[PDB]
Amino acid sequence: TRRAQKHRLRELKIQVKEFADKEEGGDVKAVCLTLFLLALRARNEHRQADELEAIMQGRGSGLQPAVCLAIRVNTFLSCSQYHKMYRTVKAITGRQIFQPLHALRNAEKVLLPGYHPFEWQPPLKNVSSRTDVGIIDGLSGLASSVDEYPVDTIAKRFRYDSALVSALMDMEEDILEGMRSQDLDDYLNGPFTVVVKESCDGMGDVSEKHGSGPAVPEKAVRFSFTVMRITIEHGSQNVKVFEEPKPNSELCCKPLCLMLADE
């Protein structure tokens, strides 16, 4: 019990106390912690040593909902099985480490375009000033009644300014880091210059028809954009505060609209 181990190790306790008062001057905590960690790492059990170091330094047990949403999107996970795994881990570990679908969807709708405000010095004629709208119909109010031109291609689209400001907002951290690295302060103003490239191409067969075989050669198309250069001109010359490492990749192709129409 406690009394037995205390009676058996009081000598070691007072010895470590004297040695810490002589060397560290009343720092038995750090001495014993470092000794325990070194022993556990020499025992070739670095897992428990790292876990103890994390739980003693003050590292959080759970994680932010943003990382959960990120891994859920990058692993192609549904909602039912995700909730199943969440509740299973919460029941096994006792504590809550992951995050339910509520905060996940909250962070999702926060990150989606059409959330944070912005403005334009010109009035931007033929464009509304509303700034809380995201996905809309790609038909743009095209009347498709019985007495008009037949059309059935479902199309969805973002707003160009909305998607643009959303991309700028999610790359704000990277461009601020670049500006801090390129011998520049933080209280800087523009006018920043952003080079945006546009691209669009078809997809081919996107229909997994299995009812009777090959039914229709349904072809789709996507219109997208990509940011690959952000510069600022201060004083005389300029400095490229952001240059895309590999723009010809399938990870920075910000999409605008999707249509189920032939090329």
Q: Which is nearer to a copy of itself, 49 or 230 (CB)?
A: 49
Cα first-last separation, the chain: 79
Residue 97 contact, options Mg ion, a copy of itself, none, Cβ 5-8 Å cut-off depending on partner type: a copy of itself
CB of 242 to a copy of itself, least distance (A): 24
In angstroms, rounded to a whole number, what is the distance separating the alpha carbons of residues 64 and 126? 41
In angstroms, rounded to a whole number, what is the distance separating the alpha carbons of residues 225 and 216? 29
Residue 201 contact, options a copy of itself, Mg ion, none, Cβ 5-8 Å cut-off depending on partner type: Mg ion
Q: What is the DSSP string of 32-61?
A: HHHHHHHHHHHTT-HHHHHHHHHHHHT--S
In angstroms, rounded to a whole number, what is the distance separating the alpha carbons of residues 260 and 149? 17
Site for Mg ion in 200-219 (CB under 5 A): 201
Determine the interface stretch with Mg ion among 2-10, 92-100, 198-206, 219-227 (rule: CB under 5 A). 198-206
Q: Which is nearer to a copy of itself, 80 or 128 (CB)?
A: 80
85: tokens are 């795994």
Is 201 assigned a ligand-binding role in the annotation?
A: yes
Q: What is the DSSP string of 159-186?
A: -HHHHHHHHHHHTHHHHHHHHHHTT--S
CB of 158 to a copy of itself, least distance (A): 27
CB of 201 to Mg ion, least distance (A): 4
The residue sitting closest to Mg ion, measured at its beta carbon, is: 201
Residue set of the binding site: 201
The contact set with Mg ion (CB under 5 A) reads 201
